[PDB]
Design a protein around this nucleic acid. Structure first.
Lengths: 237, 85, 53, 285, 127, 321, 81, 42
RNA sequence: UUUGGACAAACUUGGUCAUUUAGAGGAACUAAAAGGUUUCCGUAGGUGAACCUGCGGAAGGAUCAUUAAAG
């Protein structure tokens, strides 16, 4: 309400004049993605020009879709956050942090007349990345089933949860974080869960719902130049 | 078309077709014309309540400030000198 | 002057912004426990106002 | 115009009892003398305002709805009691009242409990007042110490004045009959009124009856009330918050009333407790 | 040749916020609400307020250089309703009409796995 | 160096004062540290005199009747006194006052100058204190004198002080605060003479009546109230503004009062009878500044958008016609 | 006597509410200032400054940019439309 | 009653104003003046 | 800090001139063209109580539409 009849407030008394457009001093900074992802171009961002610019860049998290990074609609429902950690000449660089799904997909997965099994494990990568994974699965009915529901016994849920947990620790421990991502993209880990738990109970909709990085080497500089595959200046005259 | 009232306020247009401008009228003419209307007018629910509050004298109204006033909107109200002087 | 889809406890109302709003209070009044008959009476009142304007 | 002004102050947009016998009883309890004058409130139709006109020297009536007042005027116009009767517009709380020897009126239930304390506060209050109240709230007012209906409000009024109930009025007599049950009560302001500060007593009254049953001592240990007592003690000193709490503990121990439930103890037990807080220097308000 | 933004819309019962930022979200590009664009308080949540706010943001978005945005609609969430109201829907329409290319639309309402008690009380609310 | 300056706009003006030896200039307290001064237009005045002495926006402004001395209150917690330099035909910084914990909200200058210079400087700040700063005698060095000691400091209000007014005889001054109260302090000692507390919203402005013992106070409750010093009671309560009244000033000596409100409507009011004689409507935003000259024969009101309306009394001219 | 009648003379801001840079003729005489969705063409003749023309689109779209020819005969501007 | 009268009698010895006391209500919260008129004359 | 001599603000006081200005009277002139509310249970409270409120429980309270998509 900006109308005249609106009652006056205290804060309207003293107001600074607009005399500087912030975007005059802002400087754009281009962001890049690891070599694990096909499309390294993931947009661009801006910061106030250095009076530095780098400190605000470091730790800046941005989230972009896998379909954009991999150019395939099959990954439309997955998220990966980018905290910038090394800067070169307007370019921002990263090596993996974390992952998640979309809300609409997760709601699309939850359905009536079936059982949900959710397993979470805290485990470290070979590169000392302490991370937390969340895996979700749903019971399914056989081809010839006549029962409406495909509910599983609590013992089946506990047995399947143990199998999921063992696999998640095994993949994470015996792999680097960069290698772990190379597993996340093709969903090879999800296929592994189906077959280990195939004997226990027929399942559907197996996915790793979320990945968190608890304690950290970073989304980082160290292995960055190797993962991403220095520069002399130009004379001023 | 039929002759009606005066478009201009200080003018009197009769149904005879004669227009009478008050400024040029003499006072004696103005008096009788005023009386002439008076005969014409004489023979010719909240508001009724509101007029009832106006008629009686022993009526008083309180505003949002708490002041004591009459219905008309004016604040309603001996001196030894004045009575002897 | 709207539509209501009563999917279990999930309610959707389609119409113009004011119209959909008018429906909500009637639906909510029923949820709070107003008997349908008393609610129906208020519907008649607003409906006449709708036709007048 | 006068009419436009009247519309602005009030737009001109209450159910009343019809049984005359209760009204006659209401008149009998007041026992208004011809010398004595009465203030009227919410007179309504004026069947009650004419009764007081019959038994009283002068009558001034304040009505909430201006229309309801106006017809009251029309009823009295051209009558011997016309001179005596006066009318008022707007709520009685809002403007200073003319001095009156008795209060008889159709008090609205919303302002009934607020009405009584204005009478108790107002100097030169009526020696007797007869009013109609809701039964439940009326039972609170007459509730004895330790009663289920007893309350901090009932404590204040009982100390300031003694009140007794006349009769309980059935809903069917009211037109339209309301679900609520009505009652009639007589209150007389104690003369001479006890010369105890209003704010100080209300301070003790509020602190100890946050919970009527919770112990007198348990009321004071409450963090906020202890905090309020702390600032007031600082101001008293002008004329260390753990220490005042310790001091509050001593006075509670001396009174020996702290453990007991607040409702059970009588008015003077609180008065002794009040003085102990003045001796220690902690003043409530 | 296509710089992307993130249009974060918060559709509350009594107001609608149209906020456009970079992909990261640390730096704001333009924030406009219904109160900016209306004279009466009752109409802050009106769809008409929302479309005006979106148009102002869309104009400002263009001035900066951003030509497309990712839409992250949300409601108050928490212990209250989880679906964006008509104001959020109207803002989404205006952005499409404004000409800014819409990249992806997602609902990010705060959905509690478990929540505290609501303001209404036992007998309910929203009379 | 710059030959001349043209001002596109002047932002939002908190207060305005007539300045200059001929009182033909108009000093502006805008939402900018610089002190903008413009000549009174002939009756487009693009030229503006910009003086930069402060580090933050100017909260208020006061000037001597002679127009050669200006006192500026700023948000940087300092107050500056400016003196007119006839040789350069421009104002120069005379002294600076820094001893304020918070931003200076209002500044008061003497209504009487007998020594040729103002001798004291009353100031109010968000620190909730009023400080009387003595002004130095003129010195030929022409180097700014920085004072950090005040004669007295008195805690005044629990909320922000909105305005400060000085009596004609410089015996008392009144401070308006958002705390719903106005307090009148003895100018010589700062002792609290009386407290005026009847308005329901914070008092935006307080004005001494320039001839006889009256005060006008403007609140956010859409009302103005006239107070009598001798009784310290409300003589007349003024009603009719749709929105908050921000400014209140007397014109025609005791006869009338002028008030500006957030409704953008300037209403000419009658003090004796309290009936609204005229309404002037020339703005479309809130009015924070209202200055009068020649007992209100000339009235200037500044709009928040940046529009000035230059009003002239012509009742005699209309009567002549 | 009572002071009631008054005539207000308005002093509006020539240049405000716009990011467009003000443009002036080569001779320095004609100055065009874009204000919101309006343009105030003002002459800079000393002693006779006046608003030569006022242009209001009324489309409510702000002037993105303004340019005045060096000779000053034509004025060209672009709105948000 | 006589006990009541005595206690009330002792209270007046310790009696004060209540303007500065915090209310228990907060428990829930937790030249001449006319010289210018003379310049006009002269 | 003291004596004396002028300048001299401000204060009290009786007067004297000019200005507005509050009630009650007396006596003239001018003007007056309209037609809102489900029913309860247990417990706990109430100071704008013709009734409200907190916690837990009940129906002794009006089920439309869609629905095999590991089709």
């Amino acid at each position: 309400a900006v109308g005249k009849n609106k009652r006056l407030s205290k804060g309207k008394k003293g107001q600074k004049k607009r005399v500087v457009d912030p975007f005059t001093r802002k400087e754009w900074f281009d962001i890049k993605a690891p070599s694990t992802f096909e499309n390294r171009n993931v947009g661009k961002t801006l910061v106030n020009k250095s009076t530095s610019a780098s400190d605000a860049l470091k730790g800046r998290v941005v989230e972009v879709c896998l379909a954009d990074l991999q150019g395939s609609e099959d990954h439309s429902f997955r998220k990966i956050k980018l905290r910038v950690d090394e800067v070169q000449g307007k370019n921002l660089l990263t090596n993996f942090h974390g992952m998640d799904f979309t809300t609409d997909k997760l709601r699309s997965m939850v359905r009536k007349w079936q059982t949900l099994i959710e397993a979470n494990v805290t485990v470290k990568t070979s590169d000392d990345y302490v991370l937390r994974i969340f895996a979700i699965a749903f019971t399914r009915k056989q081809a010839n089933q006549v029962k409406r529901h495909s509910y599983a016994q609590s013992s089946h849920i506990r047995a399947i949860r143990k199998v999921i947990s063992e696999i998640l620790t095994k993949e994470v421990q015996g792999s680097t974080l960069a290698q772990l991502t190379s597993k996340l993209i093709p969903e090879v880990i999800n296929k592994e869960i189906e077959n280990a738990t195939k004997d226990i109970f027929p399942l559907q909709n197996i996915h790793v719902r979320k990945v968190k990085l608890l304690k950290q080497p970073k989304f980082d500089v160290g292995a960055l130049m190797a993962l991403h595959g220095e520069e002399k200046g130009k004379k001023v005259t | 078309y039929n002759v009606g009232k005066a478009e201009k306020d200080g003018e009197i247009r009769l149904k005879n077709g004669v227009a009478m401008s008050k400024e040029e009228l003499t006072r004696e003419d103005k008096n009788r014309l005023r009386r002439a209307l008076k005969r014409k007018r004489s023979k010719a629910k909240r508001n009724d309540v509101v007029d009832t509050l106006s008629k009686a004298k022993n009526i008083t109204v309180i505003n949002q400030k708490g002041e004591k006033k009459d219905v008309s909107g004016k604040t309603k109200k001996p001196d030894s000198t004045n009575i002897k002087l | 002057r709207t539509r209501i889809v009563l999917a279990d406890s999930k309610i959707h109302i389609l119409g113009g912004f004011t119209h959909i709003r008018m429906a909500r209070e009637s639906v909510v009044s029923l949820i709070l426990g107003s008997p349908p008959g008393k609610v129906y009476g208020n519907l008649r009142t607003v409906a006449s106002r709708l036709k007048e304007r | 115009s006068a009419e436009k002004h009247l519309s602005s102050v009030f737009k001109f947009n209450q159910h009343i009892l019809k049984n005359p016998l209760v009204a006659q009883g209401i008149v009998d309890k007041a026992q208004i003398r011809p010398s004595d004058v009465v203030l009227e409130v919410g007179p309504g139709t004026g069947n009650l305002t004419v009764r007081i006109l019959e038994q009283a020297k002068n009558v001034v009536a304040v009505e909430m709805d201006p229309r309801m007042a106006a017809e009251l005027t029309k009823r009295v116009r051209g009558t011997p009691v016309e001179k005596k009767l006066e009318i008022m517009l707007g709520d009685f709380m809002k403007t200073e009242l003319p001095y009156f020897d008795i209060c008889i009126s159709n008090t609205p239930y919303q302002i009934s409990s607020p009405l009584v304390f204005k009478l108790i506060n107002q100097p030169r209050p009526p020696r007797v007042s007869i009013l109609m109240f809701q039964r439940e709230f009326a039972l609170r007012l007459l509730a004895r110490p330790g009663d289920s209906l007893y309350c901090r409000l009932s404590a204040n009024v009982q100390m300031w004045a003694n009140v007794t109930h006349i009769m309980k009025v059935g809903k069917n007599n009211f037109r339209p009959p309301p679900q609520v049950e009505s009652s009639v009560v007589r209150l007389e302001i104690k003369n001479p009124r006890p010369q105890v500060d209003y704010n100080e007593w209300d301070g003790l009254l509020r602190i100890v009856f946050v919970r009527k049953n919770r112990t007198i001592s348990a009321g004071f240990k409450s963090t906020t009330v202890m905090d309020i007592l702390e600032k007031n003690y600082k101001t008293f000193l002008a004329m260390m918050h753990d220490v005042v709490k310790e001091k509050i503990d001593t006075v509670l121990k001396e009174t020996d009333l702290g453990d007991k439930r607040a409702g059970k103890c009588d008015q003077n037990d609180f008065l002794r407790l009040l003085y102990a807080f003045h001796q220690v220097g902690i003043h409530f308000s | 040749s296509q710089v992307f933004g993130v249009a974060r819309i918060y559709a509350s019962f009594n107001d609608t916020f149209v906020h456009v930022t970079d992909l990261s979200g640390k730096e704001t590009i333009a924030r406009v609400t219904g109160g900016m664009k209306v004279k009466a308080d009752r109409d802050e949540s009106s769809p008409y307020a929302a479309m005006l706010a979106a148009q102002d943001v869309a104009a400002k978005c263009k001035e900066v250089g951003i030509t497309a945005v990712h839409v992250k609609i949300r409601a108050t969430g928490g212990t209250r309703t989880k679906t964006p109201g008509p104001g959020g829907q109207a803002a989404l329409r205006a952005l499409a009409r404004s000409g800014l290319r819409i990249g992806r639309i997602e609902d990010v309402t705060p959905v509690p796995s478990d929540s505290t008690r609501k303001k209404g009380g036992r007998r309910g609310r929203r009379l | 160096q710059v030959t001349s300056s043209i001002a596109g706009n002047h932002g939002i003006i908190a207060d305005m004062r007539y300045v200059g030896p001929e009182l033909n200039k108009l000093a502006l307290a805008t939402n900018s540290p610089s002190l903008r001064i413009i000549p009174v237009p002939d009756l487009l005045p693009l030229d503006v005199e910009i003086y930069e002495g402060h580090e933050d926006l100017l909260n208020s402004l006061d000037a001597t009747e002679d127009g050669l001395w200006i006192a500026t209150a700023s948000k940087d917690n300092t107050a500056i006194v400016w003196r007119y330099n006839e040789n350069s035909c421009k104002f120069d910084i005379y002294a600076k006052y820094i001893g304020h914990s918070a931003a200076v909200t209002a500044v008061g200058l003497p209504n009487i100058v007998s020594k040729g210079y103002p001798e004291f400087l009353l100031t109010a700040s968000n620190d909730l204190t009023i400080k009387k700063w003595i002004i130095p005698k003129p010195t030929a060095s022409m180097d700014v004198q920085i004072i950090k000691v005040s004669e007295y400091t008195r805690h005044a209000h629990e909320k922000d002080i909105n305005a400060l007014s000085v009596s004609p005889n410089d015996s008392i001054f009144a401070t308006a605060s958002y705390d719903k109260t106005c307090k009148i302090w003895n100018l010589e000692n700062g002792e609290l003479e009386a407290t005026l507390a009847n308005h329901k919203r914070g008092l935006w402005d307080v004005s001494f009546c320039q001839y006889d013992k009256l005060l006008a106070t403007s609140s956010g409750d859409k009302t103005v109230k006239i107070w009598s010093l001798d009784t310290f009671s409300v003589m007349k309560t003024l009603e009719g503004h749709t929105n908050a009244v921000q400014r209140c000033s007397f014109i025609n000596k005791q006869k009338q009062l002028i008030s500006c409100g957030a409704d953008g409507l300037i209403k000419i009011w009658d003090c004796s009878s309290g009936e609204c004689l005229k309404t002037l409507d020339g703005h479309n935003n809130r009015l924070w500044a209202l200055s009068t000259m020649n007992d209100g024969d000339m009235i200037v009101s500044a709009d928040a958008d940046g529009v000035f309306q230059f009003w002239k009394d012509c009742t005699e001219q209309e009567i002549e016609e | 006597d009572l002071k009631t009648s008054y005539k207000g003379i308005s002093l509006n801001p020539i240049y405000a509410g716009s990011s467009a840079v003000a443009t002036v003729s080569e001779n320095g005489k004609i100055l065009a200032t874009p204000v919101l969705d309006e343009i105030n063409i003002i002459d800079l003749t000393p002693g006779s400054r006046k608003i030569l023309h006022k242009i209001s689109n009324e489309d409510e779209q702000e002037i993105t940019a303004l340019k005045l020819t060096p000779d000053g005969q034509y004025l060209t501007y672009v709105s948000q439309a | 009653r006589e006990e009541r009268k005595t206690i009330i009698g002792k209270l007046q010895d310790y009696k004060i104003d209540t303007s500065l006391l915090t209310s228990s209500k907060r428990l829930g919260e937790g030249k001449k003046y006319n010289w210018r008129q003379r310049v006009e004359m002269e």
